[model samples]
Target: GLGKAQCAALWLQCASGGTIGCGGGAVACQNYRQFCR
Candidate 1:
C-alpha cells in the first residue's frame, strides 16, 4: 500500500512538471492521478 510520505513523494515526482508517462518507474501516470491530482 502507499503511505503518506510515499504518496507525497510520488505526488512531488509527478508534479515536478515532467512528461508523465503511463507506466514509468517509481512514478507513473496512475501514481500522479492517484496522488498528485
Candidate 2:
C-alpha cells in the first residue's frame, strides 16, 4: 500500500538506520528497498 516515491524515501531512511517510524515497519522498509531496486 505504498507509493513508489514514498517507498523510495523510506528505503533511503531504512538504508541508513535499517528502520523508520513513518507508520511502515522494518519489514515494510525491506519491501520498499526491493521496490526501489
Candidate 3:
C-alpha cells in the first residue's frame, strides 16, 4: 500500500523523466522498493 504523497512523487518523477517507468503507479513503486532488492 502506498500513501497519496508517495504516489504523487513517483508520478512526478516518471512524468519529469521519461526514462522512469512507474506504470503500476504507487503500488508498483512500493513493491519494487520493498521486494526488488
Candidate 4:
C-alpha cells in the first residue's frame, strides 16, 4: 500500500522535475491521483 511519503515520491516522479503547486509536501501527496491499490 502507498503512504503519504510514498505518494509524494511517486508524485515527484510523475511530475518529472515540475511542481503541483498545491502547497506543502504532504498536501501534494494527499492530492496525488495516481497510485496502485
Candidate 5:
C-alpha cells in the first residue's frame, strides 16, 4: 500500500543518508523498496 510519492520520499530519506535506524522508518522504507527502486 505504498504510494509512489510517499515511497519515493522514504527512499530519498533512507537511501540518501541511510536513515534505516530512525525509529520505525526502516520498516516503512523496507516495504517501499520495490516501489522506489
Candidate 6:
C-alpha cells in the first residue's frame, strides 16, 4: 500500500479542518503509524 501517499492526503483531514477526529484522521493515523515511519 502507498503508506506515504495515504498518509499525505489522508493527513489533510486534520489540516483541512481541525483535528484527526475527521474521518480521514484514523485512516491516515493508521497508515502513518505503520508505513509513515
lDDT of 5 by residue, 1-37 (tens): 3555555666666665454446655565666656555
1 or 3, greater by TM-score: 1
Clashes of 1: 0
TM-score of 4: 0.31
lDDT (0 to 1) per candidate: 0.53, 0.60, 0.46, 0.52, 0.58, 0.51
User: Could you give the candidate ranking by TM-score, starting with the highest?
Assistant: 5, 1, 2, 4, 3, 6
- Residues 1-37 of candidate 2 have per-residue lDDT tens digits of 3665566667666665544465546566667646666
The best candidate in terms of lDDT:
2
Better model by lDDT: candidate 3 vs candidate 4: 4
Residue pairs with backbone overlap in model 5: none
lDDT of model 3, residue 37: 37
Pitting candidate 1 against candidate 6, the one with the higher lDDT is 1
- Model 6 bad stretches (over 4 Å): 3-6, 14-27
Clashes of each: 0, 0, 0, 0, 0, 0
Task: Tell me each candidate's TM-score.
Answer: 0.34, 0.34, 0.30, 0.31, 0.35, 0.29
Question: How large is the C-alpha RMSD of every model relative to the true structure?
Answer: 5.6, 4.0, 8.0, 8.0, 4.4, 4.9
What lDDT score goes with residue 16 in model 5?
Answer: 55
Worst 10 residues of 1 by lDDT: 17-26
Question: How well is each residue in 1-37 modelled by candidate 4, as lDDT tens digits?
Answer: 3666665665775455344453444545445664543
Q: Which residue pairs show backbone clashes in model 2?
A: none
- Report residue 18 deviation for candidate 1 (angstroms): 8.9
Error of 6 at 3 (Å): 7.1
The residue pairs in collision within model 1 are none
What does candidate 6's lDDT look like per residue over 1-37, in tens digits?
Answer: 4445455655555455433345545455555556656
